[PDB]
Write a protein that binds this ligand. Sequence first.
Ligand SMILES: *CCC(=O)N(C)c1cc(Oc2ccccc2OCCn2ccc(=O)[nH]c2=O)c(C)c2cc(C#N)ccc12
Lengths: 547, 401
Amino acid sequence: MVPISPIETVPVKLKPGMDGPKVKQWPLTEEKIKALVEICTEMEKEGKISKIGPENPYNTPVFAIWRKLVDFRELNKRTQDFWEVQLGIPHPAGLKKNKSVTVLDVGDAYFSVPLDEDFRKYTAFTIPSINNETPGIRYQYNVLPQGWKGSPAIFQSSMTKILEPFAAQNPDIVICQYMDDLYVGSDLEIGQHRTKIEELRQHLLRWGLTTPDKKHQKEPPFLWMGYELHPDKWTVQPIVLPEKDSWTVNDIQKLVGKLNWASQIYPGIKVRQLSKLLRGTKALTEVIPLTEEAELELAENREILKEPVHGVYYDPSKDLIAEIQKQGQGQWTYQIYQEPFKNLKTGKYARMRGAHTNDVKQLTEAVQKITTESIVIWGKTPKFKLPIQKETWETWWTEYWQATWIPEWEFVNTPPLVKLWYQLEKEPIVGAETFYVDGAANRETKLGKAGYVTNKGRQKVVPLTNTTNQKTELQAIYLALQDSGLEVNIVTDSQYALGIIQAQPDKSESELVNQIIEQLIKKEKVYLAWVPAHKGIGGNEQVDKLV
Amino acid sequence: IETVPVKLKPGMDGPKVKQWPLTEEKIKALVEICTEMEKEGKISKIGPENPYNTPVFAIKKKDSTKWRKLVDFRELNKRTQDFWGIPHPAGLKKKKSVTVLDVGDAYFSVPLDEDFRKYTAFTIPSINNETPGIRYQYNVLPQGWKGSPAIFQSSMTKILEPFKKQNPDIVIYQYMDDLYVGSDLEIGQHRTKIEELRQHLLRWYELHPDKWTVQPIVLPEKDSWTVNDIQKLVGKLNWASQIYPGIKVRQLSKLLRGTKALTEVIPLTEEAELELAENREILKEPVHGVYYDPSKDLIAEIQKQGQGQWTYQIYQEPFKNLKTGKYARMRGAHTNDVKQLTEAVQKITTESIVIWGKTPKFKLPIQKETWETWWTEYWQATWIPEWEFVNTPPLVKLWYQ
Ligand SMILES: *CCC(=O)N(C)c1cc(Oc2ccccc2OCCn2ccc(=O)[nH]c2=O)c(C)c2cc(C#N)ccc12
């Protein structure tokens, strides 16, 4: 016999202060008992398990579905935490094309990885005896049991340590571990490729691990995690949007799942209007009617998803480019590619929940998201194509109160272009009328007043119902904007309104703020000055609006 | 040569922090660095039985092209038991010049307590989540961990004993992997003395705190005031009245009576000039009841003033500033706001280390996603402070300009 190299065992412990499992075995039928006796005798003959005496106080229930199925949920609850087998799902667009990709079944190695001997006693289980007239057969696992908490991590780490030298001394191949399958890709000639595959089978056999010589079941196209992986391209598995006379909550959730999933290769997917229907529902069986916006969005989606689209694999010798387009209503879409008309992938970004916003902030956030995703998938930041002029961005970031930065990018002229809609003056405007504004409200009756007095003698006070102090302050500014010329100075004491306007929104939840934004867009020059209230600053009239 | 027992605080498990994504060049740099360290026994590979993690990235220090490995030990540092202490040298900030030296390599000559090693685990990440990452743990005192200067403090005293006995006028402080050496000598004599100390440490950053002072509130001096000038002055004086008690604005607010054009010149009455002069005299005095409490956090606020100018304030209680400053230095960051902010954070943290011996909690005028996306690209310091983000523009900005 050729000596087999031993696989180093991983030391395993239980969670601190806890003890091994002690679960009562379920009573089984006579035929199930016989089945488990045959299976367990076979496994004992192979060495996966061993018989134990009565001294072991631990026990884990066993079932038969024959097939033996041990329920390790209790031992899993009591087992220590392990390092994750994966920190994320690989994305197909990150893969690098290979002339040959071979698949090897290392499932038989799963049962050849030994278990820490001091931990084996916690895996004990009992086969019930016929009619329960003799003591049940006591077994314990000698290898990593299927279903135990630490089996995938310990198996992956053991296989990684085994494969490390073979991969180190064959840098012209790529070896990847996924579950009980190994994937070996190379750009070598098919003969040299199959040769190095045989070398891998031998190197694995030096640890006693057997790879089947049978023609494998996996073959192009690879179906994996909702993906199709082809020799030269990748795509999502076919996305079919169902025809429904009425849509329930699960119908629309399935639809938004299919659209989100399809958005990574199909450009232009929109989920805003369909997602708007699921707001605060929390009822899986509820049936919600479709708005017209949801119907138009769904029609555009059916038009985008009518024929298949594929993405290419990554070529590290070419540049990485990401182009962004604005879609409206806080929606953004983007394409990542290295060659024109051949996308690596696509995606979308929706604006965050907020009371006020503008397009530049949203484009910035989308840039950060694409940057992070691209560093994840490809390990580098892409060069950006953005629908915003260089001078627009320079004005924005030079005048914005926050620090902001976008990586290397170039302007692409693809409407709608992101622009600044208004810019407040830095100094008071000579020759422009000066509007002193104020507003106030009663906390109980919700009655308020908003108005202004100007240096030319112009005055206005408007009474308001169902209002607050903040609303009357904004309304006062709005009245000043309505009744002034193209250039106007405005004096307020509202720290709230200044906090809003200094954030430079172009859209808001409050219709009053939106009206102020429209008025600002119509103006030529606006200077907004702030003063402390109740300090006797003449013009600033708190008494006029408190009557 | 002998390990000192180290443990965590009662009831606290080890750190489990997600490793953030890294560029390919930083990953490769970390692979080279960690391979070399593994050859030297400083670190060792670990198995899946280690569930703990601390993030790692790579930087490039000043005047050097070689990559450096930076570990973010913030979580482990706050989860590590308190070591004990030495009172902070209150004379270090009073010295004319201070030089910072990176003494981290020395930490690698002292072995780490075996049972604690598993808490220093870190992961070199893989591109595209292909592997769970290359996992390591430290065998010696790691750089950036708060226990390293505490454990090495005796050896550091033994090494610095001859130099401290030779020059009683030189102040020496230690914070993390940095050694701050303050003196009053000339720049040339200071550099030759620094080479003397580095060759002294071998066989076993110009900073001038004297050119830094606290910044008082100043008011404009004008011969003609517009309505707008007077309104801004009243606003600033009203803000300062929260800090200084006797500030008075009513005589200046009297001039604003009536609805006048913002650009109209208003002459100052005599009562207004007297009020303004009294306010000037009040602002020339220090703030009343300003003290430092070592049991409280230090809070640092930063405002972007434009044109590469930044203001900052360090305080513990509102309106009780312990330090104020204005960083306008321009160093290869003319077109990048985030790089300027990162450099400002590093400088303010250094000043806080010199003054109080600990790092402040920053309030950054930046969106979380931008900062967290880009701050590691420009970080050059061994330590890392804590920060929060302000999303509402503060009105007091122009009052610090
Ligand atoms: C360890 C495998 C893994 O994590 N993933 C996501 C995975 C990758 C993969 O493709 C490759 C495996 C090894 C080397 C190279 C590649 O892909 C390079 C691009 N490419 C793909 C397919 C093809 O035919 N040619 C080609 O050049 C595959 C194929 C699979 C498959 C399955 C299944 N079933 C699961 C995970 C895979």
